[PDB]
Design an enzyme around this catalytic site. Structure first.
Site, PDB file in Angstrom:
ATOM      1  N   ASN A  22      85.139  49.308 -24.043  1.00  0.00           N
ATOM      2  CA  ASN A  22      84.355  48.976 -22.867  1.00  0.00           C
ATOM      3  C   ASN A  22      84.365  47.465 -22.646  1.00  0.00           C
ATOM      4  O   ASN A  22      85.126  46.725 -23.278  1.00  0.00           O
ATOM      5  CB  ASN A  22      82.935  49.524 -23.015  1.00  0.00           C
ATOM      6  CG  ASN A  22      82.502  50.342 -21.816  1.00  0.00           C
ATOM      7  OD1 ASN A  22      83.151  50.320 -20.769  1.00  0.00           O
ATOM      8  ND2 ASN A  22      81.405  51.077 -21.964  1.00  0.00           N
ATOM      9  N   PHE A  70      85.483  42.997 -18.987  1.00  0.00           N
ATOM     10  CA  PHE A  70      86.907  42.713 -18.808  1.00  0.00           C
ATOM     11  C   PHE A  70      87.707  43.948 -18.397  1.00  0.00           C
ATOM     12  O   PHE A  70      88.945  43.906 -18.272  1.00  0.00           O
ATOM     13  CB  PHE A  70      87.480  42.118 -20.096  1.00  0.00           C
ATOM     14  CG  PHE A  70      87.093  40.680 -20.325  1.00  0.00           C
ATOM     15  CD1 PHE A  70      86.814  39.842 -19.254  1.00  0.00           C
ATOM     16  CD2 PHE A  70      87.006  40.169 -21.609  1.00  0.00           C
ATOM     17  CE1 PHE A  70      86.461  38.526 -19.460  1.00  0.00           C
ATOM     18  CE2 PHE A  70      86.647  38.852 -21.824  1.00  0.00           C
ATOM     19  CZ  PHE A  70      86.366  38.029 -20.750  1.00  0.00           C
ATOM     20  N   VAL A  85      87.683  48.602 -18.581  1.00  0.00           N
ATOM     21  CA  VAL A  85      87.488  49.756 -19.448  1.00  0.00           C
ATOM     22  C   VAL A  85      88.861  50.281 -19.835  1.00  0.00           C
ATOM     23  O   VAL A  85      89.720  50.475 -18.969  1.00  0.00           O
ATOM     24  CB  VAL A  85      86.653  50.851 -18.759  1.00  0.00           C
ATOM     25  CG1 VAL A  85      86.517  52.057 -19.662  1.00  0.00           C
ATOM     26  CG2 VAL A  85      85.285  50.312 -18.385  1.00  0.00           C
ATOM     27  N   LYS A  89      94.047  51.299 -18.355  1.00  0.00           N
ATOM     28  CA  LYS A  89      93.082  50.226 -18.168  1.00  0.00           C
ATOM     29  C   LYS A  89      92.566  50.285 -16.737  1.00  0.00           C
ATOM     30  O   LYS A  89      93.346  50.165 -15.787  1.00  0.00           O
ATOM     31  CB  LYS A  89      93.709  48.866 -18.466  1.00  0.00           C
ATOM     32  CG  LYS A  89      92.714  47.729 -18.486  1.00  0.00           C
ATOM     33  CD  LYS A  89      93.426  46.395 -18.486  1.00  0.00           C
ATOM     34  CE  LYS A  89      92.475  45.273 -18.840  1.00  0.00           C
ATOM     35  NZ  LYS A  89      93.185  43.974 -18.872  1.00  0.00           N
ATOM     36  N   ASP A 101      96.146  35.266 -25.268  1.00  0.00           N
ATOM     37  CA  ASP A 101      95.275  36.016 -26.166  1.00  0.00           C
ATOM     38  C   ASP A 101      96.064  36.590 -27.344  1.00  0.00           C
ATOM     39  O   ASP A 101      95.853  37.735 -27.753  1.00  0.00           O
ATOM     40  CB  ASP A 101      94.529  37.114 -25.408  1.00  0.00           C
ATOM     41  CG  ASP A 101      93.312  37.648 -26.173  1.00  0.00           C
ATOM     42  OD1 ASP A 101      92.893  37.028 -27.172  1.00  0.00           O
ATOM     43  OD2 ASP A 101      92.780  38.702 -25.770  1.00  0.00           O
TER      44      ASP A 101
END
Ligand SMILES: CC[C@@]1(c2ccccc2)C2=C(CC(C)(C)CC2=O)Nc2n[nH]cc21
Ligand SMILES: [Ca+2]
Lengths: 340, 17
Positions: free
Chosen positions: A27, A30, A32, A45, A139
């Site tokens: 969750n 950003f 689900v 997504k 990331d």
């Protein structure tokens, strides 16, 4: 549930798709992230999207095509209650580097060095590619590296933080996951480059060699402190390259921990060497991703007859596109072993 | 966010090392 969705790759072609066993995997604001079965398992997504603008993640994925990047299979839009949701249907890969690492740490075991080599080569190759396409991932962390448990194929996923870093455009400093966040970001640089990805990739490599994150900061400032306890205080000239607003402070001078005393006994010297060449304060002193692929640490992958520890072929490592061979051609003789 | 505030925090944490 069944929907008509657009093919992720190729021209705009529609396909009716049907999926079941939808379960939330994660969750957050950003987006689900669900998992479902088509009959193949898939990841979906669902993210809120301003209708007036393109979805940044969708545009990046539709532009990347590489064996070490997760595939966008389909995408489709949804509404509920101008509330628009984009749905990205992605290729499902059973494991992550994070899950594998935790299995080894829980079992009080070390990941075999061959798999560290195989996985990290693929990460560095994937970064070479996306950077050549103008995309900084922002990331890079074990949880975002998909791995097939059997073939050892690695795919980079979750381009939700990704961005094209344009020379002169300021970018958000508080980005990446903290343990993998490059020091110039912690110093609040807004003019950073895609070398933040290489810093993050160095943190993954060190983590795979250590059994735990190399820099386990519990806050922004403690993250810089954890980096400093290993690398020593950055010089004023290194701070100047990171963020020149900090060059005039008097930071305490902490000695570096010798690199060979950071890692366990019997850690390969070339592994330590590679870490130190990636984990550089000055962003421009970090190896390029292709330079890392060419590092001596990966020589075992280029040796004729090297096989996976489960005695299967190595995954695709040397099938370079014409674009890849054009990135830094002077490394091509090393990247392509003599036996081709 | 102010560099002086952040640097002073950093200096205090580094001194404790
Ligand atoms: C289903 C979503 C997932 C993922 C999503 C975002 C980052 C990393 C992986 C994911 C897994 C297996 C898992 C680690 C048990 C759970 C999980 O989050 N594999 C995937 N393949 N494609 C997307 C994925
Ligand atoms: Ca700490």
């Amino acid at each position: 549930t069944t929907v008509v969705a657009t093919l992720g790759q190729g021209p705009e072609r529609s396909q009716e798709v049907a999926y079941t066993d939808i379960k939330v995997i994660g969750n957050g604001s950003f987006g689900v992230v669900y998992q479902a079965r088509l009959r193949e398992l898939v990841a979906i997504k669902k993210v809120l999207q301003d209708k007036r603008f393109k979805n940044r993640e969708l545009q990046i994925m539709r532009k990347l095509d590489h064996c070490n990047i997760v595939r966008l299979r389909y995408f489709f839009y949804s509404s509920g209650e101008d509330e628009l949701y984009l749905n990205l249907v992605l290729e499902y890969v059973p494991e992550t580097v994070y899950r594998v690492a935790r299995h080894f740490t829980k079992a009080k075991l070390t990941i075999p060095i061959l798999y560290v080599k195989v996985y990290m080569y693929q990460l560095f190759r994937s970064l070479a590619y996306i950077h050549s396409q103008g995309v900084c991932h922002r990331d890079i962390k074990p949880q975002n590296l998909l791995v097939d448990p059997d073939t050892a194929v690695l795919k980079l996923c979750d381009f939700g933080s990704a961005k094209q870093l344009v020379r002169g455009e300021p970018n958000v400093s508080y980005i990446c996951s903290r343990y993998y966040r490059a020091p110039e970001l912690i110093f609040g640089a807004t003019d950073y480059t895609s070398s933040i990805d290489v810093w993050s990739a160095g943190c993954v490599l060190a983590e795979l060699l250590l059994g735990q994150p190399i820099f386990p900061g519990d806050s922004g400032v403690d993250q810089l402190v954890e980096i400093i306890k290993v690398l020593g205080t950055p010089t004023r000239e290194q701070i100047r390259e990171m963020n020149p607003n900090y060059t005039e402070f008097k930071f305490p001078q902490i000695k570096a921990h010798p690199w060979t005393k950071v890692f366990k006994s019997r850690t390969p010297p070339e592994a330590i060497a590679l870490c130190s060449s990636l984990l550089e304060y000055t962003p421009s002193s970090r190896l390029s991703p292709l330079e890392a692929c060419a590092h001596s640490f990966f020589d075992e992958l280029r040796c004729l007859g090297t096989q996976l520890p489960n005695n299967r072929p190595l995954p695709p490592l040397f099938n370079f596109s014409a674009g890849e061979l054009s990135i830094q051609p002077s490394l091509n003789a090393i990247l392509i072993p003599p036996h081709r | 966010l102010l560099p002086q505030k952040f640097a002073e925090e950093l200096i205090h944490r580094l001194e404790a090392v």
